[PDB]
Design a protein around this motif. Sequence first.
Motif, short mmCIF file in Angstrom:
data_model
loop_
_atom_site.label_atom_id
_atom_site.label_comp_id
_atom_site.label_asym_id
_atom_site.label_seq_id
_atom_site.Cartn_x
_atom_site.Cartn_y
_atom_site.Cartn_z
N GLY A 252 0.76 -1.22 -0.20
CA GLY A 252 -0.01 0.00 -0.09
C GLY A 252 0.83 1.32 -0.04
N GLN A 253 2.15 1.26 -0.32
CA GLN A 253 2.93 2.23 -0.52
C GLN A 253 2.49 3.16 -1.59
OE1 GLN A 253 7.73 2.85 0.46
NE2 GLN A 253 7.25 1.71 -0.87
N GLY A 254 2.31 4.67 -1.22
CA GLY A 254 2.09 5.59 -2.28
C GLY A 254 0.42 5.96 -2.34
N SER A 255 -0.19 5.08 -1.45
CA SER A 255 -1.58 5.30 -0.92
C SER A 255 -1.77 6.11 0.06
CB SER A 255 -2.43 4.13 -1.23
OG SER A 255 -2.17 3.17 -0.04
N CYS A 256 -3.09 6.55 0.45
CA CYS A 256 -3.52 7.32 1.74
C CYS A 256 -4.65 6.70 2.34
CB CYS A 256 -3.40 8.66 1.58
SG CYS A 256 -1.88 9.16 0.97
N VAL A 257 -4.82 6.83 3.66
CA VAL A 257 -6.03 6.39 4.08
C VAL A 257 -6.55 7.31 5.10
CG1 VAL A 257 -7.33 4.49 5.08
CG2 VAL A 257 -5.82 3.72 3.58
N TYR A 258 -7.47 8.04 4.97
CA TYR A 258 -8.12 8.89 6.13
C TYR A 258 -8.96 7.91 6.72
CZ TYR A 258 -6.81 12.76 3.54
OH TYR A 258 -6.11 14.19 2.89
N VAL A 259 -8.62 7.90 8.21
CA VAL A 259 -9.48 7.47 9.22
C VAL A 259 -10.14 8.27 10.05
CG1 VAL A 259 -9.55 5.72 11.17
CG2 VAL A 259 -7.62 5.67 9.45
N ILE A 260 -11.70 8.35 9.67
CA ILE A 260 -12.51 9.36 10.27
C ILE A 260 -13.11 8.71 11.48
CG2 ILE A 260 -14.56 10.74 9.79
CD1 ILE A 260 -13.52 10.36 6.74
N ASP A 261 -12.66 9.13 12.76
CA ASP A 261 -13.12 8.53 13.99
C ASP A 261 -12.91 9.16 15.17
OD1 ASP A 261 -13.16 6.34 16.13
OD2 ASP A 261 -13.36 4.99 14.06
N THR A 262 -12.34 8.65 16.29
CA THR A 262 -11.86 9.29 17.53
C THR A 262 -10.61 10.01 17.42
OG1 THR A 262 -10.96 7.48 18.67
CG2 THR A 262 -13.44 8.06 18.81
N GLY A 263 -9.95 9.89 16.35
CA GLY A 263 -8.45 10.33 16.26
C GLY A 263 -7.53 9.07 16.21
N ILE A 264 -6.26 9.09 16.10
CA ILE A 264 -5.14 8.38 16.04
C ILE A 264 -3.93 8.85 16.90
CG2 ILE A 264 -3.39 7.23 14.69
CD1 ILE A 264 -4.99 7.89 12.23
N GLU A 265 -3.65 7.66 17.75
CA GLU A 265 -2.39 7.96 18.53
C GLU A 265 -1.15 7.87 17.59
OE1 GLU A 265 -0.32 5.42 22.04
OE2 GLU A 265 -1.69 6.85 22.83
N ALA A 266 -0.77 8.98 16.97
CA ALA A 266 0.14 8.79 15.76
C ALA A 266 1.49 8.41 16.32
CB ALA A 266 0.13 10.03 15.27
N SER A 267 1.88 8.65 17.71
CA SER A 267 3.08 8.32 18.38
C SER A 267 3.26 6.76 18.71
CB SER A 267 3.57 9.38 19.51
OG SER A 267 2.44 8.83 20.57
N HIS A 268 2.32 5.92 18.42
CA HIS A 268 2.55 4.46 18.75
C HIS A 268 3.59 4.05 17.64
CE1 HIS A 268 0.24 0.94 20.19
NE2 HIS A 268 1.17 0.42 19.46
N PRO A 269 4.42 3.33 18.13
CA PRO A 269 5.56 2.72 17.42
C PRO A 269 5.23 1.85 16.42
CG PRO A 269 6.03 2.44 19.87
CD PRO A 269 4.67 3.15 19.59
N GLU A 270 3.89 1.29 16.31
CA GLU A 270 3.20 0.55 15.42
C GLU A 270 3.18 1.28 13.99
OE1 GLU A 270 2.47 -2.88 14.87
OE2 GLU A 270 3.67 -3.49 16.37
N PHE A 271 3.00 2.42 14.18
CA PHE A 271 2.58 3.24 12.91
C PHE A 271 3.97 3.84 12.15
CE2 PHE A 271 -1.54 3.92 15.07
CZ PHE A 271 -2.24 3.45 14.20
N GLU A 272 5.10 3.61 13.09
CA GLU A 272 6.48 3.97 12.34
C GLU A 272 6.55 5.47 11.81
OE1 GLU A 272 6.06 0.62 9.51
OE2 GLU A 272 7.87 -0.48 10.61
#
Lengths: 5, 279
Positions: free
Chosen positions: B30-50
């Motif tokens: 999925g490199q080069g694509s973008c996904v908007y997650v419309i929700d309660t937010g995202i903890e962007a700092s989570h190591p799992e999101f790199e």
Amino acid sequence: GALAG
Amino acid sequence: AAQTNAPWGLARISSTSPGTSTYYYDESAGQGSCVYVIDTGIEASHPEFEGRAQMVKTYYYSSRDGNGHGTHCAGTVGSRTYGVAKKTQLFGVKVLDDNGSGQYSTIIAGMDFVASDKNNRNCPKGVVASLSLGGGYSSSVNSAAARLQSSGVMVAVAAGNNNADARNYSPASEPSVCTVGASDRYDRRSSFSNYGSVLDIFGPGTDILSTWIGGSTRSISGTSMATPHVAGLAAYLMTLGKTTAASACRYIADTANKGDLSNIPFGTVNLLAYNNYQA
Ligand SMILES: [Ca+2]
């Protein structure tokens, strides 16, 4: 959705 | 590529049969694509999101996910360990408060926002929006989802968890988007999953392990969990050049595992999201 997850 | 001892949902979407534990996928991821997650937010700092996740908009005092739901859904889309599309870019839009609730006017504004914001982003392979939310029927909410899809975004929405016909729920009941029901690890329709003619596809939704706030993980259930599987799959397929935002839902339905699910009422599609990966 509905309850949606 | 192969992820051994993967969450069951990831394994399921890369197999013609239940009970496997390896997630097979193309390394493009999925490199080069973008996904908007419309929700309660995202903890962007989570190591799992790199570092591939970021908050772009909030409709509340903070952009922080104080709930966990948004982080969990984002994780299923594109976290390293728990994600379908492991190299996608994630954008968070916080339209739900930390109790997981939100007014329809705010949800609509969030959808309109994404339709515009994508024009400011570098997403060469395409744009997806994952909406793990809903409530009672609203023509205005349906219209907003229809606009987002029309603007050139692949819109995936939860069918809802009322064990009822999704026709009475929004944005689930908007025909032009991709409405996602839930299944369990034994290929049964999830006991809570909405059904009906408006459903386009099923994805794994019962006992889904993903990321959570405070840099943690947990397993939860819902059509909310099935939706990001389909959204992630769409991003993955668009990166491979197999489909476009306009036709991704149809392509996913066309290439799905057919007839595998049990407890599907007459008039509801018997189709389970499948990546058709062959090494
Ligand atoms: Ca549809």
